[PDB]
Amino acid sequence: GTSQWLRKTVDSAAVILFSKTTCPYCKKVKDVLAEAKIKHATIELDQLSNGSAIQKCLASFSKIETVPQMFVRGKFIGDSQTVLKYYSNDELAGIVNESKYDYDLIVIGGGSGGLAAGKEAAKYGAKTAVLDYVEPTPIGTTWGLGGTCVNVGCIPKKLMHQAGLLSHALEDAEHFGWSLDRSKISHNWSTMVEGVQSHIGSLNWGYKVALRDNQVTYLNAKGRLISPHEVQITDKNQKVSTITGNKIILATGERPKYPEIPGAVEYGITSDDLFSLPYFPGKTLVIGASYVALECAGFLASLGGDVTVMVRSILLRGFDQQMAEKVGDYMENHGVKFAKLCVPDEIKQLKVVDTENNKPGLLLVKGHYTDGKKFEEEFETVIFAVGREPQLSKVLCETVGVKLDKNGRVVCTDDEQTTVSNVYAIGDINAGKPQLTPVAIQAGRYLARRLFAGATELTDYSNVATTVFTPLEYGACGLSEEDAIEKYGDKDIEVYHSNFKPLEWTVAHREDNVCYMKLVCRKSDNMRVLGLHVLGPNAGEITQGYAVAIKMGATKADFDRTIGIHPTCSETFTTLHVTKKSGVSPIV
Amino acid sequence: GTSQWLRKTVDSAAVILFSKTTCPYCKKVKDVLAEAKIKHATIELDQLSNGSAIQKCLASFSKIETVPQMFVRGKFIGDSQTVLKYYSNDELAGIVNESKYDYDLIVIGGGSGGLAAGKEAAKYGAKTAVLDYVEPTPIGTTWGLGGTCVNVGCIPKKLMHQAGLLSHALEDAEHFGWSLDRSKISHNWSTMVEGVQSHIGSLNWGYKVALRDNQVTYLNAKGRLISPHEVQITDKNQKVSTITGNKIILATGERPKYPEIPGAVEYGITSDDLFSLPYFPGKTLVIGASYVALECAGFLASLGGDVTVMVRSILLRGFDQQMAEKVGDYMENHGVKFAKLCVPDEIKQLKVVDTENNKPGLLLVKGHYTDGKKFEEEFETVIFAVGREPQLSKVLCETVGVKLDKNGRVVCTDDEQTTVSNVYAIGDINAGKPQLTPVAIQAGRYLARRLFAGATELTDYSNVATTVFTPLEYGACGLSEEDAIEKYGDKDIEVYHSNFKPLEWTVAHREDNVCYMKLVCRKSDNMRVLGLHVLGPNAGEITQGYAVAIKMGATKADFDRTIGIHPTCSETFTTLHVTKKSGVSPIV
Ligand SMILES: Cc1cc2nc3c(=O)[nH]c(=O)nc-3n(C[C@H](O)[C@H](O)[C@H](O)COP(=O)(O)OP(=O)(O)OC[C@H]3O[C@@H](n4cnc5c(N)ncnc54)[C@H](O)[C@@H]3O)c2cc1C
Ligand SMILES: Cc1cc2nc3c(=O)[nH]c(=O)nc-3n(C[C@H](O)[C@H](O)[C@H](O)COP(=O)(O)OP(=O)(O)OC[C@H]3O[C@@H](n4cnc5c(N)ncnc54)[C@H](O)[C@@H]3O)c2cc1C
Ligand SMILES: CN1CCC[C@@H](OC(=O)c2ccco2)C1
Ligand SMILES: CN1CCC[C@@H](OC(=O)c2ccco2)C1
């Protein structure tokens, strides 16, 4: 058991010191390593319980049983006297840079997961390269380092959501005594984009600074894995070369899909293009019904747009469907139009985009309803939000041996290892895992620790909480209600639920029984909380804290015995009592 | 064990049915009680662990071992046939209504805890009276049913806090693209107060309707306990009379204190007066430094007031003083002025309140600083927030025998019982317990269930979470840092902390390193989270969820292994890593 850990640790670590906090000879080596700017991992044997068997098992590698012991890339380097001899002889530098490979680690993809993994491995002395390239979109849109969330996802999405929310704040202000008149105030699209892009640029710059400050090589080039240790790179001048690394981490993400209909690629856009568009979209058609589609439609409507969503079948496929419909109902009652059970057939161009005067074009959209009836309407912009997909054929020579699943995602063990023993995958291309930025970051940090510092902790991908940032927000953690019933039967499931009204909505004259929350519990397991759900303001701040208690196995009684904070929306979870089986109304 | 529960339950319950879900003879009796519109508790014996030993023990009262059995106020009434004999002969009404006292329960005080206890008791068949009266303030202010939170506390305070927050929304909206000019917008105090009071009056009426629809007798009168079972009441014409009850719950709350200085009562106001004041206070002095004082000073400045706070020693005594100082630093930097280490000596009247044209008066305030230097300045309004106290000499005849503590609060056991065996106390007047509305509500509901439905659950008063609703809010659960150090020793305590910036603050150009959070952990107990602290927006909604995880014994590892929701402020708790012992900066 313990011997197989020591072997794995010694072989992949780049520079590692085995040590004890009590021994001063270890401090003499530590101090020498610090002075020479030699980054390394350290393992203090007098802090692990099996540390006396580890000191014994070390002798299998060094033929000695004492500390300190310094290793470099699987080879024992020496004890106290031997390291000092190399220092004063000007030999230690070339020792610690001895490698069969150019890099200890090559990361392909400069996004949420890739940046996190690369920064963490460098902290333990691993020589690291991070590659990032942004394939432009069909109209040419491109952006800087940091990946999808930073440039064309969570960060600009939530900023624009926030600009939408501020419209209600101006409305509410009057009722609380302020003198403004909401009807006389308008929104400037390009002023908001300039402010959003300014912040994104400060994030691009910050990431390049952090890689320099960590000694990570940043190459703005497209990477391709041609053999288990060989990565082929193409740069901005189309110049091609090959670099080698010991461990490879794949982290290249996904890009938006287009439907195979005429005019879609030529005349539509995606979210990739939306967050830096020079003109207001104007009258917009959003095709799709994911959170991307609903979040985008939602804030375009609050910013004054004329917005329609085309729904093939259901909203928010994969989420609790009772919550999904309430999410949709609220949008439909607050200025978002819906074309239900409908799909597009072609986009025709009526007006080219006025690039000079900074205006959108004009398009004719044709489709049909599921009963055969026809759809025909004019829009200035057409946004496709019909899913996302990787394209690993552009990253992975097929002869390398990395297995993929049916959707083109990498099949991994629970320690992120692919079918090639030294190649790993993280983030959105890791098959079957939630596609979320906090997940990618955690997965990448923990893997760096396992590869280069002897760590053993795995990433836990179960019960990861979400928030859909629609005009009225929706936060969730755990199973949907229909999933829980499917898994245990209707008779073993109890559901406590209630409406509520945020106190901020009283004086502003907003709806009495629209916000809603529920807890889905398992009778036979002590009324364990299988899933939590809440529709309301600040739904992400509400939900997050509860994810810790769900991780710990919380029950209805744990909620019951905790006291609420008053006045908040979230305290409603601490006094829930109406069950669905009771048939009692949940209104307040 | 079991017998002593059954003796207490039968002796205390008003109407209680010992039943089974399987035996249809019980459904026969339940229907009779439903149609006869008779409310009662029910102890289904097939759904309890030792439900088969209770059945055998029930024969000590009835001499039968079978089910159903119905009791009224300790007396056994009959089985299936005997109860249907009383229903047929129309003898059932007078048998269920016969009591030694006027009521099964008299609640003195119609506030958070009192209204809660009463409505819950009447569910289980208790004949219940709720007394409430509002002693006017020195300048005559008065209000309706619901207690301190509803009328002069949490509810109007947070509403006015929200009007204050809306001023930053107006400022932010420009940077997000909206075309208003915050510089040209002003606030109307009396328009705000009308909105606030209209909501309050809708809650007064709501509570009265709820009491009627539960068959609870509501008397708008002053109650004095003169014997263990006798309450003397005085109505609006000072008509005295006496009613009697089996159980008595004291729940009369507190009122604001005044300092013993000339002019205070005459020319100052308190929070009791602030929330329905018919004129804007104008240039204001707030004397004190509790959460009441800081919350009020905070929203007055945001509404454009000229506000000064006079602090005797420290801000927010009893709270984590690092967080308190950050709270106050924020206020001092955003337009609240502080006069530090200073007390008042006298309030002189320069102008009487212009009650005609709706204008404040004018006062001169004289006081001195702690070194000896003098203070003298003119203000239009002076508000005292120097603590609150109960006045139980009004409520309680000393001959009855209810023991008070040195502060004037009621000494109770862990199930709220006073030193007189049938008299209980809940809420703020219960000595040593947290003075919070959700605590009073839970205590009152759980007690009603123990008195009249045979429940055993006690109220857990440990680790109750709070939120201070200052301009930048401060949420907390568990111990302060200085209290954990004192209890366990500096060497056993580790503190993880970090600054953060809300994403909403980036485009708005707000401060980078003002918001702040920390986890106070005990090393030797597995890094157990002793206390959580966060300063930032929506701090009540951030903190609430974590109160559950803390009740369940959460450790630092439980936080680490939970994944964040992105982008939120709350997710920063899931990746904390900078310790105070390390000396590394917590900036972002
Ligand atoms: C509109 C939108 C909103 C979202 N909102 C949220 C949200 O609120 N919360 C949340 O948790 N998640 C959100 N997501 C999802 C989130 O963006 C992803 O889960 C996350 O970015 C995945 O990170 P990653 O490292 O796996 O991939 P990425 O962040 O996409 O990084 C991969 C990077 O590698 C680059 N690359 C690709 N091929 C190569 C190659 N051959 N060589 C070099 N570099 C290459 C890509 O161009 C990219 O820069 C949103 C997504 C979208 C589209
Ligand atoms: C400005 C302010 C802000 C606050 N904000 C918050 C907050 O945000 N969150 C929070 O949790 N707590 C808050 N509190 C505290 C909270 O209001 C109290 O903890 C809570 O009201 C206590 O409830 P209670 O039932 O014990 O007493 P109360 O709610 O005060 O009810 C007692 C009632 O009994 C009446 N009464 C008194 N004597 C008699 C008598 N002899 N006969 C008949 N009736 C009588 C009183 O007039 C009153 O109606 C705040 C308090 C103040 C002053
Ligand atoms: C089950 N329903 C049938 C209609 C289509 C889809 O619902 C919507 O598209 C919707 C609801 C609110 C706003 O849009 C799923
Ligand atoms: C420890 N300090 C001493 C000065 C007085 C008191 O601090 C304040 O009164 C204060 C700080 C920010 C705004 O006000 C406690």
Identify all chain A residues contacting B507, using CB atoms and an 8 Å cutoff: 159, 162, 192, 195-196, 198-199
Write down the residue that tokens 């985009």 correspond to.
A353
On the question of a cis peptide bond just before residue A156, with omega within 30 degrees of 0, the verdict is: no
Rg of chain B over Cα atoms, rounded to whole angstroms, equals 28
Write down the residue that tokens 């009056």 correspond to.
B201
Query: Of A386, A404, A423, at which residue does a domain stop?
Result: A386
CA dihedral B173→B178→B183→B187, nearest 10 degrees, is: -70
* Nearest CB neighbour to A465, from listed B538, B543, B565: B565
Residues facing residue B43 across a β-bridge: B18
Catalytic residue among A175, A497, A533, A566: A566
Q: Nearest-CA distance from A181 to chain B in Å? A: 9
On the question of a cis peptide bond just before residue A586, with omega within 30 degrees of 0, the verdict is: no
Alpha-carbon span B440 to B429, nearest angstrom: 10
Q: Which atom of ligand 4 is nearest to the CA of B314?
A: 15
B362-369 sheet: strands from edge to edge: B342-351, B362-369, B374-379
Strand stretches in A428-527, DSSP E = 466-468, 473-478, 493-500, 515-522
Sign of CA dihedral B9, B11, B17, B20: positive
Write down the residue that tokens 């019982």 correspond to.
B417
Verify whether ligand 2 is closer than 6 Å to residue B221 (CB atom): no
Alpha-carbon span A212 to A547, nearest angstrom: 35
Alpha-carbon span A180 to A177, nearest angstrom: 9
Same domain for A382 and A486, yes or no, is no
Same domain for B123 and B27, yes or no, is no
B317: annotated binding-site residue? yes
Strand stretches in A93-159, DSSP E = 103-108, 128-131
* Nearest CB neighbour to B166, from listed A178, A442, A559: A178
* Nearest CB neighbour to A570, from listed B162, B166, B541: B541
Same domain for B15 and B120, yes or no, is no
Q: With H, G, I as helix, E, B as strand and everything else as coil, classify residue B103.
A: strand
Query: Residue A477 gets which letter from DSSP?
Result: E
On the question of a cis peptide bond just before residue A68, with omega within 30 degrees of 0, the verdict is: yes
CB contact at 8 A, B49 and B72: no
Q: Which of B570, B178, B537 is nearest to A173 (CA)?
A: B178
Residues facing residue A466 across a β-bridge: A476
Taking each helix axis from N to C terminus, what angle separates A189-213 and A112-122, rounded to the nearest 10 degrees? Answer: 30
Angle among Cα A373, A376, A377 to the nearest 5 degrees reads 145
Pairing relationship of beta strands B474-478 and A466-468 according to DSSP bridges: unpaired
Query: Which burial class, exposed, middle or buried, applies to A372 when counting CB atoms under 10 A from its CB (0-12, 13-18, 19+)?
Result: exposed
Q: Which atom of ligand 4 is nearest to the CA of B332?
A: 13
Sign of CA dihedral A569, A573, A579, A580: positive
In sequence order, which residues have a C-beta less than 8 Å from that of residue A463 and are 6 or more positions away?
A477, A478, A547, A550, A551
Q: Nearest-CA distance from A241 to chain B in Å? A: 37
Alpha-carbon span A525 to A120, nearest angstrom: 40
User: What is the residue with the minimal CA distance to atom 1 of ligand 4?
Assistant: B314
Same domain for B109 and B248, yes or no, is yes
Q: With H, G, I as helix, E, B as strand and everything else as coil, classify residue A291.
A: helix
Residues in chain A: 588
Query: Residue A205 gets which letter from DSSP?
Result: H
Which residues of A are documented as binding site for FAD? 112-114, 132-133, 148-149, 154, 157-158, 222-223, 252, 255, 291, 391, 428, 435, 437, 566
CB contact at 8 A, B436 and A563: yes
Domains: count for chain B? 4
B186: annotated binding-site residue? no
Query: Of A64, A79, A96, at which residue does a domain stop?
Result: A96
Residue A193 belongs to some domain of the structure: no
CB contact at 8 A, A507 and B191: no
List the single residue in B with minimal CA-CA distance to A465.
B565
Identify all chain A residues contacting B162, using CB atoms and an 8 Å cutoff: 176, 503-504, 507
Same domain for B442 and B515, yes or no, is no
CB contact at 8 A, B428 and B440: yes
* Helix residue ranges per DSSP H, B432-538: 437-452, 481-488, 504-507
Structure-token pair, residue B571: 């997710």
Rg of chain A over Cα atoms, rounded to whole angstroms, equals 28
Alpha-carbon span A254 to B317, nearest angstrom: 53
* Nearest CB neighbour to B162, from listed A176, A196, A546: A176
Identify all chain A residues contacting B275, using CB atoms and an 8 Å cutoff: none
The string of DSSP codes covering B351-401 is E--BTTTTB--EEEEEEEESSS-EEEEEESEEEE-S-EE--HHHHB-TTT-
Alpha-carbon span B111 to B255, nearest angstrom: 13
Pairing relationship of beta strands A230-234 and B466-468 according to DSSP bridges: unpaired
Method by which this entry was solved = X-ray
Query: Of A339, A367, A386, at which residue does a domain stop?
Result: A386
For A515, the domain range is 472-574
Same domain for B281 and B426, yes or no, is no
Verify whether ligand 2 is closer than 6 Å to residue B274 (CB atom): no
Residue A421 belongs to some domain of the structure: no
Substitution site in A340, A369, A470 for ligand 3 pocket (most atoms within 8 Å of beta carbon): A340
B381-384 sheet: strands from edge to edge: B337-340, B307-311, B284-287, B381-384
B113: annotated binding-site residue? yes
Residue B402 belongs to some domain of the structure: yes
Q: Nearest-CA distance from B149 to chain A in Å? A: 10
In sequence order, which residues have a C-beta less than 8 Å from that of residue B556 and are 6 or more positions away?
B496, B519, B521, B527, B529, B576
Longest dimension (CA), chain B: 86
- Name the residue type at position B61: F
Q: Nearest-CA distance from A194 to chain B in Å? A: 9
Pairing relationship of beta strands B423-425 and B240-250 according to DSSP bridges: parallel
Q: Nearest-CA distance from B514 to chain A in Å? A: 19
- Name the residue type at position A180: L
Measured CA distances, A14 to A97, A377, A448, B467, B529 (Å): 9, 62, 12, 48, 35
Query: Which burial class, exposed, middle or buried, applies to A585 when counting CB atoms under 10 A from its CB (0-12, 13-18, 19+)?
Result: exposed
Alpha-carbon span A495 to A480, nearest angstrom: 11
List the single residue in A with minimal CA-CA distance to B437.
A566
Residue B26 belongs to some domain of the structure: yes
CATH of the domain at A507: 3.30.390.30
Identify all chain B residues contacting A549, using CB atoms and an 8 Å cutoff: 545, 548-549, 552, 554
Measured CA distances, A508 to A268, B205, B288 (Å): 39, 20, 32
Alpha-carbon span A152 to A149, nearest angstrom: 6
Identify all chain A residues contacting B544, using CB atoms and an 8 Å cutoff: 542, 545, 564-565, 568, 570-571, 573-574
Alpha-carbon span B448 to B126, nearest angstrom: 9
Q: Residue B348 — φ and ψ, nearest 5°?
A: -100, 140
Residue A118 belongs to some domain of the structure: no
List the single residue in B with minimal CA-CA distance to A189.
B177
- Of the listed ligands, the closest to the CA of B331 is 4
Residues facing residue B367 across a β-bridge: B344, B375
CA dihedral A54→A60→A61→A67, nearest 10 degrees, is: 40
Alpha-carbon span A213 to A216, nearest angstrom: 8
Verify whether ligand 2 is closer than 6 Å to residue B485 (CB atom): no
* Residues near ligand 1 (Cβ within 6 A): A 108-114, 131-134, 147-149, 153-154, 157, 222-223, 251-253, 271, 292, 394-395, 427-428, 435-438, 440; B 566
Structure-token pair, residue A458: 């795995």
Q: Which of A276, A247, A226, A251 is nearest to A133 (CA)?
A: A251
CATH of the domain at B36: 3.40.30.10
| CB half-sphere exposure, A539, CA atoms < 13 A | 24
A98-132 CB burial, b ≥16 within 10 A, e <16: eeebbbbbbbbbbbbbbbbbbbbbbbbbbbbbbbb
C-alpha B436 to ligand 2 mean position (Å): 9
CB contact at 8 A, B159 and B150: no
Same domain for A272 and A381, yes or no, is yes
Identify all chain B residues contacting A196, using CB atoms and an 8 Å cutoff: 507
Measured CA distances, B93 to B32, B40, B98, B246 (Å): 12, 13, 9, 20
Pairing relationship of beta strands A103-108 and A128-131 according to DSSP bridges: parallel
Residues facing residue B242 across a β-bridge: B232
Substitution site in B162, B252, B291 for ligand 2 pocket (most atoms within 8 Å of beta carbon): B252
CB contact at 8 A, B407 and B431: yes
Is A566 an active-site residue? yes
Same domain for B237 and B114, yes or no, is yes
Same domain for B111 and B229, yes or no, is yes
Sign of CA dihedral B380, B385, B390, B391: negative
- Of the listed ligands, the closest to the CA of A426 is 1
Alpha-carbon span B151 to B437, nearest angstrom: 13
Residues facing residue B44 across a β-bridge: B19
Q: Residue A543 — φ and ψ, nearest 5°?
A: -75, -40
Instruction: Name the strand (E) or helix (H) holding B500.
Output: strand B493-500
Q: Which atom of ligand 2 is nearest to the CA of B158?
A: 8
Alpha-carbon span B271 to B281, nearest angstrom: 12
Same domain for B375 and B402, yes or no, is no
Residues 563-582 of chain B whose Cβ lies under 8 A from any Cβ of chain A: 563-571, 573-574
Structure-token pair, residue B495: 């503190």
Alpha-carbon span B562 to B572, nearest angstrom: 11
> Cβ contact (<8 Å) for A503 and B541?
no
CATH of the domain at A366: 3.50.50.60
Per DSSP, chain B holds a count of helices (H) and strands (E) of: 19, 26
CB contact at 8 A, B15 and B41: yes
Q: Which of A168, A148, A161 is nearest to A192 (CA)?
A: A161
List the single residue in B with minimal CA-CA distance to A557.
B548
Residue B69 belongs to some domain of the structure: yes
Residue B90 belongs to some domain of the structure: yes
Alpha-carbon span A170 to B512, nearest angstrom: 25
> Cβ contact (<8 Å) for A565 and B546?
no
> Cβ contact (<8 Å) for A189 and B173?
no
Identify all chain B residues contacting A554, using CB atoms and an 8 Å cutoff: 548-549, 552
Structure-token pair, residue B363: 């006062």
Residue A579 belongs to some domain of the structure: no
Residues facing residue B377 across a β-bridge: B365
C-alpha B315 to ligand 4 mean position (Å): 6
- Name the residue type at position B580: K
User: What is the residue with the minimal CA distance to atom 15 of ligand 4?
Assistant: B314
B255: annotated binding-site residue? yes
On the question of a cis peptide bond just before residue B68, with omega within 30 degrees of 0, the verdict is: yes
Same domain for B442 and B548, yes or no, is no
Residues facing residue A187 across a β-bridge: B178
Identify all chain B residues contacting A175, using CB atoms and an 8 Å cutoff: 195
> Cβ contact (<8 Å) for B574 and A438?
yes
- HEC-encoded secondary structure of B203-267: HHHHHHHHHHCCCCEEECCEEEEEECCEEEEECCCCCEEEEEEEEEEECCCCEECCCCCCCHHHH
> Cβ contact (<8 Å) for A196 and B540?
no
- HEC-encoded secondary structure of A480-505: CHHHHHHHHCHHHEEEEEEEECCHHH
B417: annotated binding-site residue? no
Per DSSP, chain A holds a count of helices (H) and strands (E) of: 17, 25
CB contact at 8 A, A200 and A111: no
Alpha-carbon span A139 to A267, nearest angstrom: 9
Same domain for B432 and B481, yes or no, is no
Choosing among A565, A568, A574, A575, which should be mutated to test the B contact, i.e. which has the most B CBs within 10 A?
A: A565
